[PDB]
Amino acid sequence: NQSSLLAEFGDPITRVENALQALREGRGVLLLDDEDRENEGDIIYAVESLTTAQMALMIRECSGIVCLCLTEAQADRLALPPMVVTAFTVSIEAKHGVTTGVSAQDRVTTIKTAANPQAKPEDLARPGHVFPLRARAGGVLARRGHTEGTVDLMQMAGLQPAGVLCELTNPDGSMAKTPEIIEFGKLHNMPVLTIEDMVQYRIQFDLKL
Amino acid sequence: NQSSLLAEFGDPITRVENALQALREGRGVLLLDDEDRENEGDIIYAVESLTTAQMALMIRECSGIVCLCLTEAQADRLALPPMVVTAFTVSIEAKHGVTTGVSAQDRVTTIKTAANPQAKPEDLARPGHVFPLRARAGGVLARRGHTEGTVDLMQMAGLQPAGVLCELTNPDGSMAKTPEIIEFGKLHNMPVLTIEDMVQYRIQFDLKL
Numbered sequence: 001n002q003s004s005l006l007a008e009f010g011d012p013i014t015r016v017e018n019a020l021q022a023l024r025e026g027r028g029v030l031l032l033d034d035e036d037r038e039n040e041g042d043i044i045y046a047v048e049s050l051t052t053a054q055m056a057l058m059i060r061e062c063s064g065i066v067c068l069c070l071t072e073a074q075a076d077r078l079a080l081p082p083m084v085v086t087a088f089t090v091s092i093e094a095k096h097g098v099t100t101g102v103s104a105q106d107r108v109t110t111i112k113t114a115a116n117p118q119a120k121p122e123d124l125a126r127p128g129h130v131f132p133l134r135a136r137a138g139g140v141l142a143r144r145g146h147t148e149g150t151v152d153l154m155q156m157a158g159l160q161p162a163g164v165l166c167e168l169t170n171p172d173g174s175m176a177k178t179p180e181i182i183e184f185g186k187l188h189n190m191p192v193l194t195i196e197d198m199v200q201y202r203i204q205f206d207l208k209l
Numbered sequence: 210n211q212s213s214l215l216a217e218f219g220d221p222i223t224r225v226e227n228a229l230q231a232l233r234e235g236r237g238v239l240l241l242d243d244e245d246r247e248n249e250g251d252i253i254y255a256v257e258s259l260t261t262a263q264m265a266l267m268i269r270e271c272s273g274i275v276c277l278c279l280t281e282a283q284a285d286r287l288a289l290p291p292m293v294v295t296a297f298t299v300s301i302e303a304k305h306g307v308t309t310g311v312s313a314q315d316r317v318t319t320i321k322t323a324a325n326p327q328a329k330p331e332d333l334a335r336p337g338h339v340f341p342l343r344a345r346a347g348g349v350l351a352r353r354g355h356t357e358g359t360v361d362l363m364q365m366a367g368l369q370p371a372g373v374l375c376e377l378t379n380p381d382g383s384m385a386k387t388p389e390i391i392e393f394g395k396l397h398n399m400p401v402l403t404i405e406d407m408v409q410y411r412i413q414f415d416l417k418l
């Protein structure tokens with residue numbers, strides 16, 4: 001069972017608290033959603049402390065379709081409508097400071113441009129190679145997605161409410177499952193937690209955000 | 210100089226002919242565009258012979274933003290308008306036969322669904338995790354992009370005019386340059402060629418497609 005495999009990381013409240021602390025230290029975490037949903041684990045990083053080396057690891061070890069989780073307000077500031085009349089907006093590229101936009105450094109530059117609380121729509125070309133996602137108001141208490149988990153995690157840690165995610169992928173191209181996620185987290189010193197963990201945590205610590 | 214580094218692979222005409230033969234054998238090739246353009250090398254595969262293991266290699270070794278190069282006609286058949294009023298359409302997912310769409314197998318399933326000459330728009334959900342690109346009519350003699358190179362390569366090899374591409378990426382997240390591309394091609398037995406090679410080839414062999 002998954003709850004028994006995660007015991008190693010502590011009880012649910014500890015798993016949340018350890019994840020929040022890692023984010024405050026500028027490290028990444030591994031977030032699993034429900035087993036009966038996608039049953040996938042994403043690498044999560046805070047935008048505020050995002051480095052080229054973190055982005056390189058995400059590209060190397062995950063699907064490479066690296067997403068920027070934004071508040072509805074920030075996506076509205078950037079004039080990012082849904083890509084289609086998972087809440088993908090149109091993809092984005094920094095208008096300045098990048099070349100082709102695909103390199104790890106370029107993606108970070110685009111992400112920081114987009115997440116800047118003083119950003120303007122002209123700051124971003126469209127389309128590009130970073131994929132923004134709109135988190136639902138209410139976070140994981142409204143939608144149990146990694147998108148909401150990501151932004152909720154940043155808010156609960158006291159950070160700017162923007163993060164990046166990408167799905168952990170096995171070398172043979174299949175999606176990592178809990179055993180593989182646990183091993184990856186130990187290898188890279190990243191705490192593991194679930195959306196369930198965050199839901200119980202927010203409810204019991206009566207935590208509106 | 211790049212032309213001297215590629216000499217190992219044969220003269221320009223040989224580099225084209227070797228690439229075409231690899232595609233007919235169901236193997237991949239490495240296509241470089243102009244040094245003063247993106248100066249990037251993409252892994253290219255024919256859709257017709259695409260395997261999960263080929264897709265896994267692309268995700269592992271490239272940006273992970275794996276693109277499906279289509280004729281304008283095929284994109285029109287699928288009712289794929291531009292993602293924005295590089296010719297990205299809206300992203301796509303197979304409507305059937307996939308789970309979350311990100312796994313190597315799922316991407317291949319989506320690609321084969323989209324490239325089927327009998328496909329219908331209802332076959333594809335939007336958005337998704339495969340990114341189609343419209344090749345310009347005229348191919349590399351109209352636009353010197355990897356998008357056109359990909360589709361031109363399939364036509365010249367006598368294959369269905371659909372291929373996939375993705376940008377070769379170094380482990381540190383920078384984009385591979387010619388030395389690294391050459392080494393990768395030797396390691397994985399993939400021929401290397403340039404868009405320039407294909408332009409001279411099409412012009413001299415007076416090759417409309």
Ligand SMILES: O=C(CO)[C@@H](O)[C@H](O)COP(=O)(O)O
Pocket residue numbers: 033038065067086144145146147148167338
């Ligand atoms: O497919 C995607 C992003 O490409 C999303 O589904 C992410 O995989 C996680 O997003 P959630 O749906 O869990 O919020």
Ligand SMILES: O=C(CO)[C@@H](O)[C@H](O)COP(=O)(O)O
Pocket residue numbers: 129242247274276295353354355356357376
């Ligand atoms: O950025 C992209 C795809 O994400 C494209 O630019 C590809 O990198 C190659 O396409 P071309 O512009 O060379 O046709």
Ligand SMILES: [Mn+2]
Pocket residue numbers: 033038040042145146147
């Ligand atoms: Mn997810």
Ligand SMILES: [Mn+2]
Pocket residue numbers: 242247249251354355356
């Ligand atoms: Mn390119």
